[PDB]
Design a protein around this nucleic acid. Structure first.
Ligand SMILES: [Mg+2]
Ligand SMILES: [Mg+2]
Lengths: 108, 289, 108, 289, 289, 289
DNA sequence: TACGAGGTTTTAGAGCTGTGTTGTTTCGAATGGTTCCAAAACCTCGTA
DNA sequence: TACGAGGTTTTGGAACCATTCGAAACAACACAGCTCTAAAACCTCGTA
DNA sequence: TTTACTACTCGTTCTGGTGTTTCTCG
DNA sequence: AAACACCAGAACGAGTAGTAAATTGG
């Protein structure tokens, strides 16, 4: 089944090297397909546990080694049970897991 | 090389940024990771593309299917270089033995006829299924008696009426034409990814429509489209196309596995190519049962 | 089994009313027993699903109605599978689910 | 159908369709080309923005469009499902190339390369080494079994860059040579795919991991062009040599008794080599620096 | 009113902030939510408390057990006002009928004797278990024959040897003394939470040690401590106390449920009090089986 | 053991143990009290910091410590497991209070309250209403079956604050009266728990949800103290009346023919009322404003 | 008469709690594999 | 004799992937409840 | 000894803006 | 047309510090 993967990070910004690490890590996270759930919180949709293992391996390879960075993997059913006290859910297809995606008329 | 099939219908601009397909309509901006996209299908003739996005799409082996003014597919991108050892695969393809090619084509045409017979069997049309099964036994190497044509004729006449023919311009025939050029695109992409060429195929002695190998491998998989077109024979073309788009979201039983059509097509193509070029594999089996 | 409850919020700070709402919400979150997992991210340990239902009811009662606030409930086993790329896990008993807690000598 | 002009898009531009005209809306100047005079549209740079309307019309007018990647190398091409360009037939011819004609054309090409190396070495006043390379040229045979090309390219490099030189090293001269050779390889691959023939089936080169065997085989005589520029600026960092290497695009060379730009020379050379290989004629091009 | 049992052994300061027990040692600062804490046990005589924390602890019905210099419990806080309708419960307790009190005390003393018999049975000491079971039948209302004392005597002599006595000063006897003043604290807290009083109990005609009702209800639950002390008879006092602290983390089968000792104590106390004051309930059953 | 002094801690302080001395380390001044002269330690405010060493020593010296909450109401008390204070025996006496003695003491107390209300009403020059209340005082009976207290109270309130005044109203006079009554109730409850008796068993009040029935029963005669202060500052906001109400702590009143602070009056009054109820003596205190 | 001082029970939800249970998720371990590339391994032989 | 110009296979590992499956986990629902506060009755019987 | 309020003040986070560069076997 | 570097420059998110107040039936 489809996995979801939430990465939460707090990184120092005191030194220019730390800001380099933060910028490069954000670039990597966006390039690998992480949607901003909130500020400093990112989510990625994975097809299966093999993708999750590959992605955690890639993250360990590209670990900035600064700040506090944690990962939690939850099933898509578990992620769908998330309660929204306020704000609006992100309705982009990147969050959704539909195989057949229509940009425009859905013929329905 | 992913799961999402992306269909674009509205005037917009398609761009690239950080491994993403940047879709920027005047109303919405919407980003899709390139790893997820498997097929990109641009029906509307108002989409504005960029060349860097095209390069990145062909880098990830993403099928890109352009469409005409009537929203029917007209062309599709295939990469020159899809496999690292492409030269070796092409050289091995050039040296394909005629005996092995004939044997594998016989196997796949038997698979096609058998799938047609099974579909007629499950369709509660028992009688014609037995006739197709009988025609299957009469088939031999290279099909001298054209039993494949006879099976197709009885199949179509039983499903769509005796008056129906493949060359007719009726709506459900355009539906099959749309379906078969959606399967052919994926099969051509997979045979290119395997390093081979679509031009040189098993049959017709290299008399090529540029999709000879893909059209030859497609044969067992045409009942997939034929079933969807058949059970929606009453609906109009748009509804039948909408239902045809469900091959990208439906799981089919292949090799004792419930795999989606993309994976089945990929694995079948790879196994057929490995059975041909190296003679070190067994012919695959796809069953519509 | 023991549940864990992660609350993530982004709240506006443009107006004095928004800052008041943020301050009151943080006070409420800390008073109800939320440990700061990271900045803007809090976690609460719940004994069971009854506690989870009661706590989401309390949060809905005390909803600041500003910003984007979301809740995810995961099992303690799921929370234990969290991967720490960097930083140190919080080892306070508040994070732990041990019934018998020793401050000092554990007699072992 | 398809006319005669090949339109190459190498700069930032937006291409649009209008009343059977392709609108090359470059930043510097806007041009309009009638769609009946265009035979191949080669989008080599990645700065191009194109429309689906243009793609549809170019397919209907039976035009072949070839997309290249960041390295200005052909990466994809648009294949219509039904109506095909003439260049497709070239593939068939490439599949049937006799051994002897390939032998003869490769031998002539490598003879040109060896003669060019000898000419340049004589130009740099190394007359003894030039005479040695000329003798190795007399030692040539069919398909070069005695490896005269290898020893010629050893004397050439040791004469130009010292006896301590080695292509496996990681100095600046080697990097510049690699970059210029990449430039020429990109040019020759683009002109090979324009002719409709593949780069993965070569006259002599048979490397599996090489996907530009034909491109390398044809570009062999032109290597001294890069070698001369690298040697002329040997005592410089890589960026200066690259800035000087970009002059090959805007320079002129003598080919067929005329002063032609190097891109036109490459295109005409590739077309004549493919013509000679197709057995239509036996004329082999001659390029001498 | 929670699950965590908090034991403090080091010199520190205990304070209050936002429903939290602020524990600030010179090394570490550590915060515990008051809702989680069930028992707070201060063995070390160097802990510095504050009155606000004491008020907030008694507000949440958190057991606070102070300890002497030898780390043994010496006192514990019980709230004056633990139930809203405390006056009604006290008035109903004052009007407890002697018949109902005698019947319920007979039921609970039978539960105690039966639990002792079962523990001796599972202890592979079959013979003495039968004697205790026989003594159970001889027991009548208010136990005129002191069969409860006879059962306790055989129980202790069988578990800890015939020479062992309850009044001896041996180590495992101090272990039972420590255990029984840990259950008695919880039972006193629960009977106060029920609105009742510990002073007026079932037996002895209100001759009170201030814990008469709690000590009366505790009777079926003493085998819990007796088992842990028995199976660790070899170890020293500190190890036996460490194992005794496991009653707060171990689940016991009560009323067909696997509940922790706190919930079992609360349920048993509430059901006994409801069977007494209103005569509208059935006597509970706790089984060590 | 336990001596005579009752030590009340009502201000911010740190209490510590030292060589059999309690160290009242208040901010203003530091005091030391020998642990043999202390009988009850009443920690009424929540600003106090205490040590476990003090708790242990106070338990060993058989001292009763009583913790009060933010509202300065007794909320908990420390009960040693083994050695008990004398006040515990008082509970037994409270359980056995004859109906007739409770009748007599309650009637005397409410007679004092009615006489005090009449005296104050006469003091405010309402002589006719004072005479009416005095007549209702003559109408008193055992346990006040004719509800002379209620009618006297309504006359009192309608005379002081107008006929439109009602207790259920939400004006500032009612809030001030409630706050002052809460002050007196806290005082009387603290002095009742000091005597060892419970506040949940009252002479007349039997409200389930009231946990200070006996405190209310004793504080009835002292209500005119609050009423006079509220009436004297009727035309003011609640904060001003509260600031004036805080003067009852630092004022003096005539009791037993001496000018005593109101806290001492309350303590001595409570002790004498409990003495009269214990049937040790039949003297009833008399407080008149 | 009505209100309402002095009070006492009744209800009526509101918020809170812990454990069983039955079917249905879920988790890795397993099972087949798939490209891709950089480092070897080989050829000829002419000049150092 | 060696190196390396012109080259070609060969071979590990690295990274990636999709479906199964068997036992263990988990999620609301369902239970037995619990405490607590306010909002209604009810009483007596003076003084408007 | 707490809470409740008010600033202030640093860290943390992301977006917009401004250049500079964009073919490294065969 | 896109990546990569650098900065600003507003939005979030907590921690600290100074001040005022702390019994609202019976
Ligand atoms: Mg963060
Ligand atoms: Mg946030």
């Amino acid at each position: 089944r489809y996995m979801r993967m939430i990465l939460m990070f707090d990184m120092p910004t005191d030194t220019a090297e730390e800001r380099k690490a933060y910028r490069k890590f954000r670039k990597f996270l966006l390039s690998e397909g992480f949607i901003m759930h909130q500020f400093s919180v990112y989510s990625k949709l994975l097809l299966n546990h093999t993708a999750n293992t590959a992605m955690v391996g890639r993250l360990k390879a590209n670990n900035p080694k600064k700040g506090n960075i944690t990962i939690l993997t939850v099933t898509e059913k578990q992620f769908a049970r998330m309660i929204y006290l306020y704000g609006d859910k992100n309705t982009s297809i990147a969050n959704s897991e539909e195989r057949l995606v229509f940009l425009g008329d859905n013929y329905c | 090389a992913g799961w999402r099939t992306v269909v674009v219908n509205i005037h917009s601009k398609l761009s690239y940024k950080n491994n993403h397909l940047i879709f920027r309509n005047s109303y919405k901006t919407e980003m899709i990771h390139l790893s997820e996209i498997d097929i990109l299908l641009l029906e509307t003739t108002d989409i504005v593309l960029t060349t860097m996005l095209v390069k990145r799409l062909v880098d990830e082996n993403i099928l890109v299917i352009f469409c005409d003014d009537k929203r029917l597919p007209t062309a599709f991108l295939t990469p020159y270089y899809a496999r690292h050892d492409s030269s070796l695969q092409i050289a091995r393809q050039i040296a394909w033995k005629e005996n092995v090619k004939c044997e594998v084509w016989t196997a796949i045409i038997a698979q096609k006829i058998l799938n047609q017979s099974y579909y007629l069997g499950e369709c509660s049309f028992f009688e014609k299924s037995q006739s197709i099964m009988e025609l299957y036994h009469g088939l031999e190497r290279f099909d001298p008696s054209n039993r494949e044509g006879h099976s197709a004729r009885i199949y179509f006449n039983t499903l769509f009426g005796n008056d129906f023919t493949r060359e007719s311009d009726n709506d459900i025939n355009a539906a099959l034409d749309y379906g078969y050029t959606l399967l052919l695109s994926m099969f051509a992409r997979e045979v290119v990814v395997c390093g081979c060429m679509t031009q040189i195929g098993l049959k017709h002695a290299n008399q090529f429509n540029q999709f000879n190998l893909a059209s030859d491998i497609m044969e067992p998989f045409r009942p997939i489209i034929d079933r969807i077109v058949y059970q929606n024979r009453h609906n109009n073309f748009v509804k039948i196309k909408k239902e045809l788009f469900s091959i990208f979201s439906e799981t089919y039983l292949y090799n004792g596995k419930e795999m989606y059509l993309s994976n089945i097509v990929s694995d079948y193509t790879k196994k057929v190519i490995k059975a041909l070029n190296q003679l070190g594999e067994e012919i695959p089996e796809f069953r519509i049962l």
